[PDB]
Point group: D2
Chain length 128, copies 4
């Protein structure tokens, strides 16, 4: 239902993603989480194009082990907390078996033009 | 001394920082916080080069109002709670009088080569 | 005839301790977009510029910290096209030289339009 | 060398296409990968340094897109070399990068 792994994306880190001390910069993690989230929403008939859509209100990451080039990583994604307009999404970042990072993003649905929160769509509601 | 404003960075957003939705992409915020912080460490005569240095162990941001090109934004940074190896830095990012975001970063001091926790610099200790 | 000065971000560097080369194109792009915005040419509108060619010469590597200056000029005016130069100096040293050929087209219509006269005034 | 990959949505700028610098990121990554295959790493004291780089934009790339980069050594100087990265979407050539590299 809700807190199950609903999306798994595997990909490779670019060497230029690393900063001057030789590991992937922290913002790139949020880029990764971004692509995984967007891909899953793509799976769910939810688009960035429409008049109304999701916006990140909060996002966070816990770094347990550093990632160095080259590395093949897997992201396991689950959605946990649904408000009326808000939702929480979790991203687990693995290198091989080893778990490298923890992402948590609070996303809100809004009318982009009117920058006001709008309630959450039914298709995610169906994950109960 | 501690939760006092210890760094203030004012700058203009780059157009290329915006995503396909016509406002600044979320990771770019973490770039901003990262550079403000690094400038402050520079202010404490701390540079990223030495045998010992800061490592982000946690980072988070709350986005209150969207940012569009062009915009002049200010980051106000304070250090709030100090451990032996860890510290937290808070960032308020305003466009003019309005608050766009609030960032929280937990940083740990380590020996980079050995990947081990190391105590906080004394120059950081002076803010108590 | 235009100079944008700024400070290098530490995160612009790659794992080899120098500003990444693509980041230069980000810099030049920002200088160009800035200068066009100053002349009230905006990225928002239905019609706008599209870069068809861009190039950079790397003379000296840039390391954090560095305060750099970009000097942007349009050297050659076509009818629909233009050539713009962005030279990146760190104080007395010239660090990089970028050259971009730019044409104006309609994003919606995917079609050519002649040059504005105000750009002709950058001569 | 042939590197195929997929475009990230965040690679796009506010105009709905891949930002121009990211192409140089792509080319650079293809180069580094080929070097990795030939057991050449930037870690060592000796390595290639790009002195010139250029790109011609022929057709815009929109998300999603599966792109193939074909990279070859074009011209060998004594210290210099020219390297080409042609970026194709399927059969269509989308961009062409040319970089002059020395050691
Ligand atoms: C969304 C936004 C307009 C506020 O909308 P709103 O109409 O005022 O309604 P809310 O503030 O209550 O936001 C909705 C949810 O965000 C949550 N939220 C609000 N403040 C929060 C905070 N400081 N931290 C974490 N979550 C928060 C609320 O719990 C709320 O949950 P709900 O669905 O149960 O009501 C504002 O956050 C915003 O400007 N977002 C833009 C997003 C952005 O800047 N970048 C995203 C990438 S484009
Ligand atoms: C930072 C790091 C080396 C510490 O490793 P560790 O096994 O957690 O060692 P410790 O548990 O002793 O951590 C020590 C400090 O970090 C804190 N900490 C440890 N584990 C934590 C966790 N899971 N979550 C949040 N904080 C944690 C501790 O409170 C402690 O702070 P203190 O000195 O004030 O008491 C490790 O977490 C790591 O590899 N992080 C990613 C490295 C990196 O590249 N960061 C850059 C961002 S990309």
């Amino acid at each position: 239902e809700i807190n199950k792994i609903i999306h798994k994306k595997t990909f490779d880190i670019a060497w230029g993603d690393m900063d001057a001390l030789g590991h992937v910069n922290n913002a790139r993690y949020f880029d990764y989480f971004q692509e995984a989230r967007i891909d899953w929403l793509r799976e769910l008939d939810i688009k960035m194009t429409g008049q109304t859509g999701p916006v990140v209100i909060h996002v966070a990451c816990t770094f347990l082990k550093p990632i160095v080039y080259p590395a093949t990583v897997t992201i396991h994604s689950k959605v946990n907390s649904l408000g009326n307009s808000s939702m929480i999404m979790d991203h687990d970042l693995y290198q091989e078996e080893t778990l490298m990072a923890q992402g948590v993003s609070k996303i809100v649905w809004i009318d982009y033009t009117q920058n006001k929160s709008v309630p959450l769509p039914d298709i995610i509601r169906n994950l109960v």
